[PDB]
C-alpha cells in the first residue's frame, strides 16, 4: 500500500517496453479536426490507452455503468473510469535499432 523499503533504477530493455505498454501506435494523426475524436490507432485512439469518457465503450454496446473488466468485442476497448487513461502507456516499434 504505502511500504517502500527502497528504490532502485534499472536500465530497461526492449522486452520490458513491450511488457509495459498496451498498444502499438501507427499513425501521427491527432484528435480528428472535424468530429473531435481520436483516429483509428492514432496518437489518442481509445483502443490503446482507454475510453475518453468513464464507463463508456467506443461503440456504445456496453455503455451501462455495471461493466468493469469487460472488453467490448465490437470496438475492442475496456470499460473503466477516465483515470485509467492517465496510467497506461504505448510503445512504438522501430524498424532500425537506435
Amino acid at each position: 500500500v504505502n511500504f517502500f523499503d527502497e528504490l532502485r533504477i534499472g536500465l530497461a530493455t526492449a522486452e520490458d517496453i513491450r511488457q509495459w505498454s498496451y498498444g502499438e501506435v501507427k499513425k501521427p494523426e491527432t484528435i480528428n479536426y472535424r468530429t473531435l475524436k481520436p483516429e483509428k490507432d492514432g496518437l489518442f485512439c481509445e483502443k490503446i490507452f482507454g475510453p475518453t469518457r468513464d464507463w463508456e465503450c467506443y461503440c456504445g454496446k456496453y455503455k451501462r455503468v455495471r461493466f468493469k473488466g469487460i472488453i467490448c468485442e465490437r470496438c475492442g476497448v475496456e470499460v473503466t473510469r477516465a483515470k485509467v487513461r492517465r496510467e497506461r502507456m504505448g510503445h512504438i516499434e522501430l524498424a532500425a535499432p537506435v
Binding site: K26, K27, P28, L43, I92, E93, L94, A96, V98
Partner: protein, 98 residues
C-alpha cells in the same frame, strides 16, 4: 515526427532501394529519436515557432519547472482561510478568535 519517419522507413524498405537512401533515412530516424529524448543536447535544436526551442521529454525533470523541483515548492491545500489580524487583549495565551 518519429512515427512518420518510422513509417517512411518501413515503406521504403518494403519497396526496395539502394544502400545510400536507406542509410540516410536511418540517420534521420536516429536524429529524431535523439531530439525527442532531448532537444538541444547536441547540434541545432529543432524550432517550429518563432525560432523557439521546443520542450523535449527530458525538460520535464530539469529546470525550474522540472517535476522534481515543483514537488518541493508546495501544494494548495484545503480547509484553509486568510484574513486580517487585530490585536485582542481579552484572550488567554493559548486562545485565538475566529
Amino acid at each position: 515526427r518519429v512515427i512518420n519517419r518510422n513509417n517512411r522507413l518501413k515503406r521504403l524498405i518494403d519497396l526496395g532501394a539502394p544502400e545510400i537512401i536507406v542509410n540516410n533515412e536511418k540517420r534521420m530516424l536516429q536524429e529524431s529519436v535523439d531530439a525527442l529524448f532531448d532537444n538541444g543536447r547536441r547540434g541545432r535544436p529543432v524550432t517550429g515557432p518563432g525560432n523557439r526551442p521546443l520542450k523535449s521529454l527530458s525538460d520535464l525533470l530539469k529546470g525550474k519547472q522540472g517535476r522534481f523541483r515543483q514537488n518541493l515548492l508546495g501544494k494548495r491545500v484545503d480547509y484553509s482561510g486568510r484574513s486580517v489580524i487585530v490585536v485582542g487583549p481579552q484572550l488567554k495565551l493559548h486562545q485565538c478568535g475566529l
